[PDB]
Amino acid sequence: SIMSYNGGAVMAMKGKNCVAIAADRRFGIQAQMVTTDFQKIFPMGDRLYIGLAGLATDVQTVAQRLKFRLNLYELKEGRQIKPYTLMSMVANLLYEKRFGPYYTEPVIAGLDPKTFKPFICSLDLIGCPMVTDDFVVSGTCSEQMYGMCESLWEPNMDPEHLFETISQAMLNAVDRDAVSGMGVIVHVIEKDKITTRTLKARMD
Amino acid sequence: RGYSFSLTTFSPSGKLVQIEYALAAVAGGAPSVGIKAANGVVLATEKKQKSILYDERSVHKVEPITKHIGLVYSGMGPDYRVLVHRARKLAQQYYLVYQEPIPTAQLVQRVASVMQEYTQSGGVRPFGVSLLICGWNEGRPYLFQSDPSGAYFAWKATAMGKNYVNGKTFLEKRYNEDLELEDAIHTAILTLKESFEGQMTEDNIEVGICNEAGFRRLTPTEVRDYL
Amino acid sequence: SYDRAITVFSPDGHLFQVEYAQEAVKKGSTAVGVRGKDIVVLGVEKKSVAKLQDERTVRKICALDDNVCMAFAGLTADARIVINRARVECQSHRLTVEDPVTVEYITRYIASLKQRYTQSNGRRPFGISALIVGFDFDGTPRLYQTDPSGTYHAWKANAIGRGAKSVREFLEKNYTDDAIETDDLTIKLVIKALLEVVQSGGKNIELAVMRRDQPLKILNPEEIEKYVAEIE
Amino acid sequence: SRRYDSRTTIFSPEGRLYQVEYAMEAIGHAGTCLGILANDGVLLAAERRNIHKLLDEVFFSEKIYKLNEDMACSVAGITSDANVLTNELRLIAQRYLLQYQEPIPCEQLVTALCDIKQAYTQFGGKRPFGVSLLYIGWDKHYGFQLYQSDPSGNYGGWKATCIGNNSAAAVSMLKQDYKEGEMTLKSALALAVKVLNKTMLSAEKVEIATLTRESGKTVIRVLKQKEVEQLIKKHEEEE
Amino acid sequence: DRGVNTFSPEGRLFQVEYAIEAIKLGSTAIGIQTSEGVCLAVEKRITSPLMEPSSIEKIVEIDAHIGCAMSGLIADAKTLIDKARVETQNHWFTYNETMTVESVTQAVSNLALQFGEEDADPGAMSRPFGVALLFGGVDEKGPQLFHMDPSGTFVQCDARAIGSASEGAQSSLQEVYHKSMTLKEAIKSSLIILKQVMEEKLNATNIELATVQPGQNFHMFTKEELEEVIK
Amino acid sequence: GYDLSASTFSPDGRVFQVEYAMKAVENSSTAIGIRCKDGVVFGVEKLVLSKLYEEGSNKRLFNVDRHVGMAVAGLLADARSLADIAREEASNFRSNFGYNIPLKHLADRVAMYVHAYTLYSAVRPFGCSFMLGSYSANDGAQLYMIDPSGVSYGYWGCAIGKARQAAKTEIEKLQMKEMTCRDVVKEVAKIIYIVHDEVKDKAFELELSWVGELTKGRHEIVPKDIREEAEKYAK
Amino acid sequence: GSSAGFDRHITIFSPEGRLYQVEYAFKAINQGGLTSVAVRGKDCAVIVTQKKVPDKLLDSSTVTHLFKITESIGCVMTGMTADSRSQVQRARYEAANWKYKYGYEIPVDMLCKRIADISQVYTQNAEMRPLGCCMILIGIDEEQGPQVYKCDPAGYYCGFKATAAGVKQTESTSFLEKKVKKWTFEQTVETAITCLSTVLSIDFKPSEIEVGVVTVENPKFRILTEAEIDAHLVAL
Amino acid sequence: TTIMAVQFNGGVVLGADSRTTTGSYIANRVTDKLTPIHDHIFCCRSGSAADTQAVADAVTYQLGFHSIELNEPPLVHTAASLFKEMCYRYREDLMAGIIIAGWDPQEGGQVYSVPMGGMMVRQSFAIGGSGSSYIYGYVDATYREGMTKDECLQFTANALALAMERDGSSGGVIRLAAIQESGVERQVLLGDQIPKFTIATL
Amino acid sequence: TTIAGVVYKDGIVLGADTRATEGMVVADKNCSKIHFISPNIYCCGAGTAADTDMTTQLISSNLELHSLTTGRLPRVVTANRMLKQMLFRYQGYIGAALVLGGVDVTGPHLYSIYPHGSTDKLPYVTMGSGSLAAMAVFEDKFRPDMEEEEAKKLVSEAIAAGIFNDLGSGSNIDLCVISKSKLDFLRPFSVPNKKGTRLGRYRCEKGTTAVLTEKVTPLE
Numbered sequence A: 001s002i003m004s005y006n007g008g009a010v011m012a013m014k015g016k017n018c019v020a021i022a023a024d025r026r027f028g029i030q031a032q033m034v035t036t037d038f039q040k041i042f043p044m045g046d047r048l049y050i051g052l053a054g055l056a057t058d059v060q061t062v063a064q065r066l067k068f069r070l071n072l073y074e075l076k077e078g079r080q081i082k083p084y085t086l087m088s089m090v091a092n093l094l095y096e097k098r099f100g101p102y103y104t105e106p107v108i109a110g111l112d113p114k115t116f117k118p119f120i121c122s123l124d125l126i127g128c129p130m131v132t133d134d135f136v137v138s139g140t141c142s143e144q145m146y147g148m149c150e151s152l153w154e155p156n157m158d159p160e161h162l163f164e165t166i167s168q169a170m171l172n173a174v175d176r177d178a179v180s181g182m183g184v185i186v187h188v189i190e191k192d193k194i195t196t197r198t199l200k201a202r203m204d
Numbered sequence B: 001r002g003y004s005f006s007l008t009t010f011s012p013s014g015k016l017v018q019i020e021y022a023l024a025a026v027a028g029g030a031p032s033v034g035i036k037a038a039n040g041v042v043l044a045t046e047k048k049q050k051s052i053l054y055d056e057r058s059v060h061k062v063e064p065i066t067k068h069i070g071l072v073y074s075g076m077g078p079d080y081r082v083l084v085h086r087a088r089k090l091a092q093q094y095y096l097v098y099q100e101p102i103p104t105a106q107l108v109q110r111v112a113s114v115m116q117e118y119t120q121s122g123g124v125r126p127f128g129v130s131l132l133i134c135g136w137n138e139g140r141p142y143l144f145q146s147d148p149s150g151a152y153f154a155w156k157a158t159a160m161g162k163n164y165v166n167g168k169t170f171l172e173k174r175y176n177e178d179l180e181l182e183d184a185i186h187t188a189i190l191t192l193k194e195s196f197e198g199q200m201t202e203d204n205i206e207v208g209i210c211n212e213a214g215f216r217r218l219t220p221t222e223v224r225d226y227l
Numbered sequence C: 001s002y003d004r005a006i007t008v009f010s011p012d013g014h015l016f017q018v019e020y021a022q023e024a025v026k027k028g029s030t031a032v033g034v035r036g037k038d039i040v041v042l043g044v045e046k047k048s049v050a051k052l053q054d055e056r057t058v059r060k061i062c063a064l065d066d067n068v069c070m071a072f073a074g075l076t077a078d079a080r081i082v083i084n085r086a087r088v089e090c091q092s093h094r095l096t097v098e099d100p101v102t103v104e105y106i107t108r109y110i111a112s113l114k115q116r117y118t119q120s121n122g123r124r125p126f127g128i129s130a131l132i133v134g135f136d137f138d139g140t141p142r143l144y145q146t147d148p149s150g151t152y153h154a155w156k157a158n159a160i161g162r163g164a165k166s167v168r169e170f171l172e173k174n175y176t177d178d179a180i181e182t183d184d185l186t187i188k189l190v191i192k193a194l195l196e197v198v199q200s201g202g203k204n205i206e207l208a209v210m211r212r213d214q215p216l217k218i219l220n221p222e223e224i225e226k227y228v229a230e231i232e
Numbered sequence D: 001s002r003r004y005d006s007r008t009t010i011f012s013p014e015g016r017l018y019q020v021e022y023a024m025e026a027i028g029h030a031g032t033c034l035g036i037l038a039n040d041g042v043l044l045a046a047e048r049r050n051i052h053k054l055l056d057e058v059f060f061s062e063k064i065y066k067l068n069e070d071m072a073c074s075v076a077g078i079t080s081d082a083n084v085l086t087n088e089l090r091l092i093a094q095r096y097l098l099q100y101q102e103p104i105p106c107e108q109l110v111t112a113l114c115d116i117k118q119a120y121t122q123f124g125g126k127r128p129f130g131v132s133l134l135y136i137g138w139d140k141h142y143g144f145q146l147y148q149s150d151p152s153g154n155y156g157g158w159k160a161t162c163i164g165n166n167s168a169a170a171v172s173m174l175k176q177d178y179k180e181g182e183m184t185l186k187s188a189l190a191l192a193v194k195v196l197n198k199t200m201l202s203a204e205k206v207e208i209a210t211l212t213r214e215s216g217k218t219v220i221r222v223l224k225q226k227e228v229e230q231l232i233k234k235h236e237e238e239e
Numbered sequence E: 001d002r003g004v005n006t007f008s009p010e011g012r013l014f015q016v017e018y019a020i021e022a023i024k025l026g027s028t029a030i031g032i033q034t035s036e037g038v039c040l041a042v043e044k045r046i047t048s049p050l051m052e053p054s055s056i057e058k059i060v061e062i063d064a065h066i067g068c069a070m071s072g073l074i075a076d077a078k079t080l081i082d083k084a085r086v087e088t089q090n091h092w093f094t095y096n097e098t099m100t101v102e103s104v105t106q107a108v109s110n111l112a113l114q115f116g117e118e119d120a121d122p123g124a125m126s127r128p129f130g131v132a133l134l135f136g137g138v139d140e141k142g143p144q145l146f147h148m149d150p151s152g153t154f155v156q157c158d159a160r161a162i163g164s165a166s167e168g169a170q171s172s173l174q175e176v177y178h179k180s181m182t183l184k185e186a187i188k189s190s191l192i193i194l195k196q197v198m199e200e201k202l203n204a205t206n207i208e209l210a211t212v213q214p215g216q217n218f219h220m221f222t223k224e225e226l227e228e229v230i231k
Numbered sequence F: 001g002y003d004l005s006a007s008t009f010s011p012d013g014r015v016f017q018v019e020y021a022m023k024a025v026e027n028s029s030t031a032i033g034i035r036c037k038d039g040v041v042f043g044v045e046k047l048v049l050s051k052l053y054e055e056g057s058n059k060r061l062f063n064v065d066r067h068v069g070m071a072v073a074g075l076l077a078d079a080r081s082l083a084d085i086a087r088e089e090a091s092n093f094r095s096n097f098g099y100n101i102p103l104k105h106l107a108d109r110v111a112m113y114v115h116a117y118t119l120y121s122a123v124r125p126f127g128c129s130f131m132l133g134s135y136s137a138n139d140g141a142q143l144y145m146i147d148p149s150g151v152s153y154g155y156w157g158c159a160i161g162k163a164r165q166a167a168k169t170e171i172e173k174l175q176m177k178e179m180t181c182r183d184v185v186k187e188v189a190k191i192i193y194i195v196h197d198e199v200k201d202k203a204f205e206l207e208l209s210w211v212g213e214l215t216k217g218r219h220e221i222v223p224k225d226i227r228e229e230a231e232k233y234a235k
Numbered sequence G: 001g002s003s004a005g006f007d008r009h010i011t012i013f014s015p016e017g018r019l020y021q022v023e024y025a026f027k028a029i030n031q032g033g034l035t036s037v038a039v040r041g042k043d044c045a046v047i048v049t050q051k052k053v054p055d056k057l058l059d060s061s062t063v064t065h066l067f068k069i070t071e072s073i074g075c076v077m078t079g080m081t082a083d084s085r086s087q088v089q090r091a092r093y094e095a096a097n098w099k100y101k102y103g104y105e106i107p108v109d110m111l112c113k114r115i116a117d118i119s120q121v122y123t124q125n126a127e128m129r130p131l132g133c134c135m136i137l138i139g140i141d142e143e144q145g146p147q148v149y150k151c152d153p154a155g156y157y158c159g160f161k162a163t164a165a166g167v168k169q170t171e172s173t174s175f176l177e178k179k180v181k182k183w184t185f186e187q188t189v190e191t192a193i194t195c196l197s198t199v200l201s202i203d204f205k206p207s208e209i210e211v212g213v214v215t216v217e218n219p220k221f222r223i224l225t226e227a228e229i230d231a232h233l234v235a236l
Numbered sequence H: 001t002t003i004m005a006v007q008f009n010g011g012v013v014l015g016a017d018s019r020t021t022t023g024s025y026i027a028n029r030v031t032d033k034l035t036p037i038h039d040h041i042f043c044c045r046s047g048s049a050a051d052t053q054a055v056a057d058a059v060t061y062q063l064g065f066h067s068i069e070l071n072e073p074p075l076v077h078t079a080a081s082l083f084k085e086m087c088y089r090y091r092e093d094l095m096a097g098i099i100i101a102g103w104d105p106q107e108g109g110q111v112y113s114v115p116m117g118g119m120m121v122r123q124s125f126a127i128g129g130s131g132s133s134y135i136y137g138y139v140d141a142t143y144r145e146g147m148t149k150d151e152c153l154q155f156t157a158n159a160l161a162l163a164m165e166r167d168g169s170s171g172g173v174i175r176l177a178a179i180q181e182s183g184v185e186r187q188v189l190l191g192d193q194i195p196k197f198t199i200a201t202l
Numbered sequence I: 001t002t003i004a005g006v007v008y009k010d011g012i013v014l015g016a017d018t019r020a021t022e023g024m025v026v027a028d029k030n031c032s033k034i035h036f037i038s039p040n041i042y043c044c045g046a047g048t049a050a051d052t053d054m055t056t057q058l059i060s061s062n063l064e065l066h067s068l069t070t071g072r073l074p075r076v077v078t079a080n081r082m083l084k085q086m087l088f089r090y091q092g093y094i095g096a097a098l099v100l101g102g103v104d105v106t107g108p109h110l111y112s113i114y115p116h117g118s119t120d121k122l123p124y125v126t127m128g129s130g131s132l133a134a135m136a137v138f139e140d141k142f143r144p145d146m147e148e149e150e151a152k153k154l155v156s157e158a159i160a161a162g163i164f165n166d167l168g169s170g171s172n173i174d175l176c177v178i179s180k181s182k183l184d185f186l187r188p189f190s191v192p193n194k195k196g197t198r199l200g201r202y203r204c205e206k207g208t209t210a211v212l213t214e215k216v217t218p219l220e
């Protein structure tokens, strides 16, 4: 598979009045690791982050083209983009290449501007939006991630309780995948802060 | 084939006469009045064919661009049909990408761009119509005015067409910030009554209102009662 | 797209559009050029010498390559377009042939593009003249001059722009085989030529020299003030 | 077809381009826009020509636009032409940032838009853009800058300038009041107000924007009604 | 106002008639065809002592066996000269043989009337080339001199003079040229005629002579060579 | 100045350029067409400008199809290109629907192409008028006429060119309907000898083409014998 | 009445903001020398046009101003004959294209609007002139019954109860105005004929005019015959 | 699929099955394969459902417009020629087996065959579809010249019924159509009305 | 995926499941398969999820534009034609099999559009991987001119048949009742599946996960 060439996994969880977005940091060509600090999560505007998983070249391309569109959109209609609007924008971009698509499964997570309501979603390669209420996973080890989030996620967790759940889910999901890991970066988006910490993972 | 040179050029004094002549065509057309009032916006126009053979229910001056945006004009009738079609396609295009009703300000800007393209393109003349767009988004009313040159202004209450200067004075000393939609219509029709020559009926004017529920074109019944 | 014939012949076999393009070059700032032995100089008169204007953003002398540089006279906007197209050709010539372009090669290209605009549909001729100055691989200093029509000639010393005739006559009688003997001598001949077609020369003159095996060097006001003191 | 042609991009006997010169005449009858370069920032003080008792405030500004993260501009001429020009300026800045992954330098942006303006004066047979622009921004190569641009496609960097209604009267006043190299943002605002008044004021008849640097970040902001009002009162004390 | 493709009442294209009037302001170029080669000579006409006379190329090389002397708008002739060079190079690539002088003149005369506003492409001429050419080469038929003008009509001539002083020079060739005249005799005749119709005293740096002989190739006289015949 | 382009109306509401193109058709020779009980007969008085020309040169009668004929007037260069335009339409129609194109449709299709040159400044209106004649078992004998403005109408007896107002009074005395085709040929050659001016004009060749039941629905030039005898009857 | 530049030659605004060229195209409608009258009834629409025959050699049948756009939509053209057929050909293609794209028959007001939009492009572009003709379409709508529409050379269209076109347009509209203030199949036809006869003052014979109708009971556009048009002629 | 068209003096008689199968599953068990191209012109579709519907819509559009310009009832041969054009043009992209059959004032009742390749041949009767292979011998031994409009309806019903039993791609009901100068008359034959043939049993 | 629709006495009843799988894994247990085309026309879509959304979103905007122009209520034929013509133009490469149902001036119409471009106008249809299970219920209990409540029960049984017999369909049941005077979008209509209650908690107490770096940022 083309998606399993560079590895990586992104995860987004929902809390009471907060969101969390975690991702692996290993960048590697097939079985060989190159760097251990590849960026898979990009800031789309204060309380809006986008995590990309899949082909590393398409992860950077899609992140750069979405930023290009996001900059023009925010300048045109001078306002902060809304989480749901970004998903439609990203889905539209991915659907332009319907027969020569980008190999990347995006995972959007952020708080709605002004209302501060949590929002998480995931899209497929051809831009198929899927808004959920609990969590969204994307990567080469989604099965492992699906099993962790299903039995760990709680309806209304707080910033600290949410951070522990998304970290335990990622740490145990990337330990079962060979081409995923080498560090885990977690971003917890609140109403007035953006805590970012790197978890102590296995360097295997 | 088609000409590829600009029909509208700068004069020695620095004026674009073609646009200036198009504004003179807009200043002779049926009067239009736009009023933004707290909970909504109202757009009224003198839809009088004055002949008694024309079907009053057939043609329409006040058109809905989208579910929350209405349009009204002053100037040439056929030119307005082109702009209304362009404004409807621009609203659909925007909604196909962002999956959310195009904001009133975003539509005006997009529609004003089209009007500015006919003042610099080859083998064409500027649109001879001034639009009065109105919309409602993000719990707030909007009222814009896009003239033939392509420039747009945000107003609170305005009037175009015949006797527009006279209506702007009668509107500047009769309009209040804290005004309700229902009362906004009363002062919108009263401003149109100051240059209506004959007798005003329910089939001589057309009124469209905008609010939280979305743009609506008042039916004859409603207007009758208001009159 | 526009396909109208702008430049056409007239009753007396004239090309009015090109003649009006040369009329725009006469209204431009004076640009002097002097070819020496181991140094080529370029002098440009600064008409609008406003004190509230960054002078580095409005220069008439540019560098096309590391061995070629030029000055102009006429419409500044056009000069920019011609200067950037010539810069792409210098980079294109380096990609196709190992060696850098020769002064004449790039001058030929600049002049050929100018002639192209005087005979195509929908366009008007360029309203600028150019003084391409540089060094070849052999170390031979070069100086050419292109104009709106598209013709170019090699020169020993030339001036363009307003009052170019007055400066050209001054160079004919002053340019000998002793005036360009030394580095400073050649630089002093260019500053003297600009002093007959300028107001209070010394703070309204901007010159740049180009020595062998070295990039363009723009002499600042302080250095130009030191040369004016020796011509007193 | 050739009889209706107006021949916009054509030279004249004197060697001038009529169309471009007629567009420059339209920029002298527009709202006065002035820019001043300081040491900690650069500002734009433009006069509002869209004043009425029935006009809404809606937008964030009327003449001053944001090109990108570290750039802004103030137009002066045809209003609809600026809408086209400023939208193209935003595109150029986004295209550059998508290519090198860095903010486009101020002089590179101004130059790119000038190449488009000059192309409309040489071929195509269309009228030129009747607008003059003023740019203020900050880059890592030259820091704070202020550029001007006209309909012909000509541009230049300045320290203090003015385009619009009374450019010549305002330019002279700035000439004898600009202390080059020792100007601060605070002292520049006074200069703007002092020149803006003597070239026309209320706090609703003008709009000011400053561009400064804070913690490795460009900050563009339009001064508020109250914010400007105080400035206008302080100039009255010296008069 | 009229279009570029407008006929006059006498049956002449205005643009071409004005382009032929622009060749009366150019420098003179006398060409004499003999049995032992062709000889071309042009009046450089320098307007300044600072102006380098070696940068003035009125006579160019189309190929080893073909030369070319031009008059009128020199800038317009750079496009015709390149076409001729590519035409003779193309011929060699396809048939492995040199193109004849008349064939090269025919291919350059085809572009002469290729201009117009309407129904045209981006890279189309807007007017005619205001320049005249004198083609001199040696093929299977020996020395041959051809003349091509703005109208696109190429004819053969034993002796031709194009430029400002063509009328005066053409008459001086009509009574000084014969079919048995040598190539060395032709070079002197041309120089003598050129010196008479010129304003500046003829010298080694003023004019430019070129010759093409049967067994040899195109050759441009240097300063030394020129001086020899000058005295 | 309201008569320099076809995309300009004059104050009264006329397109002068199209009216100027009709002037060219009133300067050409007279051509007539008569429809009868079973065919159409075309008679064009070919005016020979020189004695050097061969008898039959510069024909004004062409076969646009195998069942359709075409007599022209006005400019010949323009009319020749219109005849090739009519041939394409007739040929394209057979390759699409599989059968001979109806005269009514062919006339309309060619008239619409002629009306497209009367709207723009890029082109000029055709300076020629022409008649189309045909015969079909299912249809019958048809005769249409199209002018420079792109107007096509059905007729019984038509006449174009210089002498058309004098040739229409000669065709009005005939009872075409009850008449046949062999009897009409004579009358067609008689009217052309009456309208033709022997003074102003010089030598003239008489052309004759027909299409009906006689020739089994095939348009052809009237047989030499029948044309020679008809020419003697006119004299 | 002021003017400047080439406003009278090409469709470009004049000093007063008018389009002289478009106004000159309205005078081209009267050049034909005919009048058309369409009257809307209660369950039927009636089109009445003048059928003049200049020459006796002209095959009368081919001379007509009534056309069948669709199976239920019919129209009458007035003005430049060549322009009329062109516009009629355009309406046929647009109508056929509508049914193939949307799956249902085009409404009379949609076709009129569509044809009027095409006429507005000639008023904006300067490389071509507007058509000097008028169109009056009549059809039966499934929901709103009988419909009578009309679009002109300016690109303006509308819905009517009774319309007129041609040299005598003001005469037929001033007579239809007093008649509407005061209709069955026969009453809709008789009112049209009377209007056309009282304005032209000719007292038409059978073969001298043409009528087209679209009733609610039989929506297919049809042209009355010689013996059908005569029956109404001997009713008044 | 089993379509069939026969002709008599007055006009023609059409017939088809109604099964639409996507593999071994019947997606539509009551498909209407007989498509009206005009007033008196029909066409039986066979092959690809999407290809036959696209072509029929296109031809119906072209024929309608052509008939409105000529102001005359379209010829059945004209409709068949239009079909043939598209069938031949896009023979490498389409999979259709159209059978055009109608009635016109000129030639009367005609049946045209436009097989896969795009050829057009007129016959007195034609059969198409996958189930037409089993009734080739039956139609050759039962067809007789002079059949009336009543015998043609019984001939078509008999042949279609025999093909529906042997073919897995044919079944459901039988949709008939009798086109004459008077008009078109549709008729469906369900379970009990469908001709039955005693299955050989020991 | 199990989508179905029927035509009752005076209206249309559309239904669908809410499960979305990414192979043999449930990605979304509550996705909406019933799309809004217009006020009187809705659409159930199976096949390629991305193509099903984009095709319905485009056709709905075209029908909205057409509605604004004509000023009348859109027809089901118009939506059918637009879809079938566009689908046919992509030569089946746009995997979008939808069930189109709505009520207009002609009455209630139910169509079934296939990826290649073919359509079928029937009284009841089923699409998806669990289409054969839902078709068995329609071929065993469907009756013409059914009552609104009867049609809702029969269409619920059809979706339930697919949800419990097909591995590609699960979660809840979505219904959509379109009649001459109403439009009832019931989501969810029935919930036959419910996650089992936890037998024990697995809460991650604070400090259970080590941290190498930490950086907080105060937003305005």
Ligand SMILES: *[B]([O])([O])[C]([C][C]([C])[C])[N]C(=O)C1=[C]N([C]2[C][C][C][C][C]2)N=N1
Binding pocket: H001, H002, H019, H020, H021, H022, H027, H031, H033, H045, H046, H047, H048, H049, H050, H052, H129, H130, H169, I114, I118
């Ligand atoms: B027949 O069996 O040939 C029949 C003729 C058609 C109905 C005109 N064809 C089919 O049965 C048929 C089925 N399909 C599609 C297959 C893929 C799913 C949708 C139906 N295409 N033709």
